[PDB]
Paper text:
These proteins all exhibit an analogous protein fold to domain 3 (D3) of the CDCs, which forms the β-barrel pore. The disruption of this interface allows the formation of the membrane spanning β-barrel pore in all CDCs.
We further show that the CDC from the terrestrial bacterium [name] (desulfolysin [DLY]), unlike PFO, exhibits a high level of pore-forming activity across a wide spectrum of temperatures. DLY was crystallized, and its structure was determined by multiple anomalous dispersion to a resolution of 2.3 Å. Despite the relatively low sequence homology between DLY and CDCs from Gram-positive bacteria (∼40% identity with PFO) with known crystal structures, DLY adopts a similar overall shape, topology, and domain arrangement. Most CDCs have just one cysteine residue, which is located in the undecapeptide motif, whereas DLY has three additional cysteine residues (C54 in D2 and C166 and C266 in D3), none of which are in a disulfide, although C166 could not be altered without decreasing pore-forming activity (E. M. Hotze and R. K. Tweten, unpublished data; also reference 4). The D3-D1,2 interface in DLY differs substantially from that in PFO. There are fewer than half as many D3-D1,2 interfacial water molecules identifiable in the crystal structure of DLY, compared to PFO (15 and 37, respectively), which can be attributed, in part, to the greater number of bulky nonpolar residues that result in a more tightly packed interface that excludes solvent. Consequently, there is a greatly reduced number of hydrogen bonding interactions present across the interface, with 12 protein-to-protein H-bonds in PFO compared to only 6 in DLY.
Author numbering:
A (entry chain A): 2 to 475
B (entry chain B): 3 to 475
Write the structure that this text describes.
């Protein structure tokens, strides 16, 4: 009982700041040279603007695939930045008994006391699990009820921070490599469906040293890594369940990828249907789908397409599968929560990471049709502004139709084609009355109109009754 | 004999036409301009700045006080100072030119006299009293009408969009943009212009014909003539009336433009008597100045837009004297020049840089949660909160304090959010009492906008959970 009393004193005297001992490290971008850029796709004008952003959120710690046997409820760890990177460092010493509590929904919480070891905690969990589904028939079922998350992802750090997942696992299965992806002109959108089936918690002993066997000494802890820079931690809680990831990769722009997916996919699945779209499909055809399913079932799929109605229904089925939880069909560990052993303060961290958001806007070209059928001489004036980005400067050039002011007779009809960089259209029509005190009469003067696909201005009538109609009548 | 020699001096007087007069635009430094934010009260305001430039043809206005030297058939020394409203008179003695008055509907009636401010003015008005006498009409329609409007950043943007005389407007409207920008005021300008008639002059083929036989080449070098400063001929002058309306405000550029564009048109100002209280308080922050340049001049300061009598007064100023009459003198507006030697246009293209200021306003809002059903529910509300700090758009994920907590009916509460909240998601769950399916999701809405009021109502029973959201979407 003398060794524990030394561990308590050395623990209580171990001075460290809970907030700064582990720290998320995100991407930094350090450069303001993000000028707008432009191009044309025939009459279509495509402007791409870039903005530096950072995303801030509580960092959820995934249970790594390769360290499940070290992150079980009641495990001990040495705090280390390498825990945030998916490599938690076991604190391997002998321990005394701890209360482990399984929280299953609709059931009263059953607990059991054992020395926290992977084999002991696992057996205890699987026993309580046996009694629960050995009491719902053989072993039974849980319908899909998912938390939903979606986002474009710039790099591995935005991914980890928004989705709280094990990058290492997801890199294996979904084949995520952002150097290859940006080297091509590809963007990535990611959806996650997440369902927690049950949780398992562990109570930290009032006096912390009580977690150790009586034989363990302070000197064993220091040899394993413990110190003020690496205080000990206690796995307070692990969640178990099922997780589905959908990765959408495209050469389309970020903005067009996000818009296409946001309109065809949601928390309800994929509602993509036939007879109300046609260029949507040539977009969709450019989107490669990958899927990984983890917990319950285990599956990965690659090479699916959203044109096919039967790929869409295969996806929705994967998503809305009921899971038959049993001894032969387990749940996967998803996230775990650590507390500092010294006092029981959380070791959850905040994370920040910077990224470059790219916004693409497409502005379609258009036409102005002028038609004169009136019994008089008429002139048309058409002007507009043309937008250009030349280095980091929005250049605005006033322009004019070559025919402005010229006299026009009898049946006259022309089309003025405009590209998507034209704004601020002004149109004026005048008809010569033939009478000296009112020689030119203005039948229409529309300024500041927008470029629409087809604008038609018709004048007709006679010298003293001049008609004007514009379509659309903006 | 001086004609032989003056004519050959303009042999190949070395100058490029396009280079001898060049528009001097504003240039902006390329120091970074970061987004700026502030809050009024729960309303969130983001201000962004973009460096721009505007290019167009530069219409040269007739400067007040240089009308004596920019009449048709007058002679000028070329020079960057002309673009700035100080054209340099070339005062030598001149022969006779054919000057042609162009009245709308009239035959082009010409006369040949010695180019002089007094000569052409008398010659034009003599032609005017003749066209008026041969008409029972007191009034005729102008040859042309033009309506323009824009925000203005500095004097150069103003000169280029409007082809105005900067100096006349600076004095009459007391414009100064270094003071205006300091006080955080924005400026919207509108112009109405009527050209009643033009008055052109034909340039003789043998250019020297324009000088009396007594003037020599040395009388001209003494007037300032060079290769750097070739001679100009005022070929055509437009006469009429012009009015400027200057709208000045502590409102933002975006909001000033949007308010004026919606209450002004080529027909004048329209304010609906049934105006929203929001719209009326913005109009109450707009001060209106007016400069009228015609046969009569006038300047108005401190007009307002807050009553229909204020709007009437302004529309009456705009449309007063917009028809040519015997009693309603036209005034010179714009003038066009050729190089005396060969006759090509001395007209220049212009470019100027400015900083455009785009302001967006994001009102606050509430989410009301209501629970009426016969079961235990929990709500989950999250959003992102936007900030601009340094040059960084910062997005902080936030959650309602009450998330995940069991709620028993009746429950009601309100979550207030300010306008930097975006991307709202709301999840409502109900406990069925069945171990199979303990928790059932009854509504899950993500990526929603912050509206002034979003109501989420849940009711029903454990196995029939009802859900309504208003606005649905």
């Amino acid at each position: 009982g003398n060794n524990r009393a030394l561990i308590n004193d050395k623990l209580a005297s171990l001075q460290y700041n809970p907030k700064t001992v582990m720290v998320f490290n995100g991407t930094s971008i350090s450069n303001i040279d993000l000028p707008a850029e432009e191009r044309f796709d025939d009459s279509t004008y495509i402007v791409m603007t870039r903005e530096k952003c950072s995303y801030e959120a509580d960092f959820d710690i995934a249970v790594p695939s390769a360290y499940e046997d070290v992150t079980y409820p009641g495990a001990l760890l040495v705090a280390s930045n390498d825990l945030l990177d998916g490599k938690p460092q076991e604190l391997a010493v002998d321990k005394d008994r701890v209360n482990i509590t399984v929280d299953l929904p609709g059931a009263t919480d059953i607990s059991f006391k054992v020395v926290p070891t992977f084999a002991n905690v696992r057996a205890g969990i699987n026993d309580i699990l046996s009694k629960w589904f050995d009491s719902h028939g053989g072993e039974w079922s849980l319908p899909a009820n998912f938390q939903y998350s979606s986002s474009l992802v710039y790099d591995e750090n935005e991914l980890m921070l928004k989705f709280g997942c094990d990058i290492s696992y997801l890199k294996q299965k979904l084949s995520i490599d952002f150097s290859s992806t940006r080297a091509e002109k590809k963007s990535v959108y990611l959806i996650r469906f997440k369902q927690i089936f049950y949780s398992v918690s562990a109570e930290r002993p009032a006096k912390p040293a009580d977690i150790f066997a009586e034989s363990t000494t302070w000197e064993d802890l220091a040899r394993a890594g413990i110190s003020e820079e690496h205080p000990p931690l206690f796995v307070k809680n692990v969640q178990y369940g099922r997780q589905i990831f959908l990765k959408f990769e495209s050469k389309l722009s970020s903005t067009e990828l996000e818009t296409t997916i946001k309109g065809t996919c949601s928390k309800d699945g994929l509602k993509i249907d036939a007879n109300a779209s046609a260029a949507l499909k040539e977009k969709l055809s450019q989107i490669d789908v990958s899927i990984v399913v983890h917990g319950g079932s285990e599956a990965v799929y690659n090479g699916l397409s959203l044109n096919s109605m039967d790929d869409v229904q295969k996806i929705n089925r994967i998503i809305w599968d009921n899971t038959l939880l049993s001894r032969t069909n387990t749940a996967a560990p998803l996230n775990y929560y650590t507390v500092f052993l010294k006092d029981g303060v959380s070791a959850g961290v905040h994370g920040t990471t910077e990224y470059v958001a790219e916004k693409t806007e497409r502005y379609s070209g258009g036409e102005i049709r002028l038609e004169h059928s009136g019994w008089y001489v008429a002139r048309f004036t058409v002007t507009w502004d043309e937008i250009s980005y030349e280095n980091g400067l929005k250049v605005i050039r006033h322009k004019g139709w070559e025919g402005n002011g010229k006299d026009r007779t009898a049946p006259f009809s022309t089309t003025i084609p405009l590209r998507g960089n034209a704004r601020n259209i002004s149109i004026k029509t005048e008809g010569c009355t033939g009478l000296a005190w009112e020689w030119w009469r203005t039948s229409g003067y529309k300024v500041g109109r927008a470029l629409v696909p087809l604008r038609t201005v018709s004048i007709g009538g006679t010298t003293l009754h001049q008609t004007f109609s514009m379509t659309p009548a903006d």
